[PDB]
Design a binder for this molecule. Structure first.
Ligand SMILES: [Ca+2]
Ligand SMILES: [Ca+2]
Ligand SMILES: [Ca+2]
Ligand SMILES: [Ca+2]
Lengths: 154, 152
DNA sequence: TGACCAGCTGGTC
DNA sequence: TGACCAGCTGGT
């Protein structure tokens, strides 16, 4: 019905090829949970996806939590819609990989070690107990903090 | 390795993203943008700038839902379903888009009339459950197909 | 920002 | 088949 549709059809074959490339890499839907972006991070860093929980591992066995952000829209990294010590429990264990995008375009990739994150885990932990054991609705990690505390791996 | 293929494939992927922006979709890889765009272009609907999602030329607003029947057979509704969520939901028809991976299979339409069955269920359960939010109660594709108007 | 608000979904017994 | 269990985020 909408005319632009024929353009989508011309494009679609290549899109399907990208999906195949993502499927070849453990991602089954490039349009789900940022699959399309996650692939970019994997192919660049040489990390592999893990089939909930940690998101990836390197050839050394190290597992990681991976995060994305569209700098064209926001500056604070999302974490979890219901943060609490149990969620912070999983997080504290592995280093994180933060990817920065301008839309779907990969800008950079930083890597923070658990130590680089205690600060926020402590804040959230502190606020948790205090607020009367009330979950925190997606607290954010500034892109600035990531850039100044992580290691630019890309 | 495969990084090359991705780089080759990229110009097009970027066109699709340009095409989505044009149609009010910020990221094709976020919140299923790439798929929302497919439905808009087929149905001819227009996105809405996060309650209702699209609207027709007549000005009728819709709640739009998607699914990969390769993985699941139940439509997600809301992670924290409560009588407020429901109150709004009750105001507009729904567009259900069925997919096989990234391949759009079909699209259906449901009137609030045809969803009141589930609204009542969640509401009653919410109230009698001690006012506890329901964690993403699902609407079966079989229900959608049997009570909805195929529009694709 | 710190802190509130609010989206899109799959997985399973 | 209902009812629980979880994930990816942006907006102010
Ligand atoms: Ca995770
Ligand atoms: Ca993540
Ligand atoms: Ca909505
Ligand atoms: Ca929707």
């Amino acid at each position: 019905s909408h005319p632009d549709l024929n353009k989508l059809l011309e494009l679609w074959p290549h899109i399907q090829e990208y999906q195949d490339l993502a499927l070849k890499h453990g991602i089954n839907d490039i349009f789900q949970d940022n699959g399309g972006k996650l692939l970019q991070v994997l192919l660049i860093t040489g990390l592999t996806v893990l089939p909930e929980g940690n998101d990836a591992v390197d050839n050394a066995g190290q597992e990681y939590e991976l995060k994305s952000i569209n700098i064209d829209l926001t500056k604070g990294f999302s974490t979890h819609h219901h943060m609490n010590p149990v969620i912070i429990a999983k997080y504290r264990q592995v280093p994180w990989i933060f990817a920065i995008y301008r839309g779907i375009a990969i800008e950079a990739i930083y890597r923070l070690e658990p130590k680089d994150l205690e600060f926020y885990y402590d804040k959230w932990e502190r606020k948790w107990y205090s607020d009367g054991h009330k979950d925190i609705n997606n607290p954010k990690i500034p892109v600035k903090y990531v850039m100044e505390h992580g290691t630019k791996i890309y």
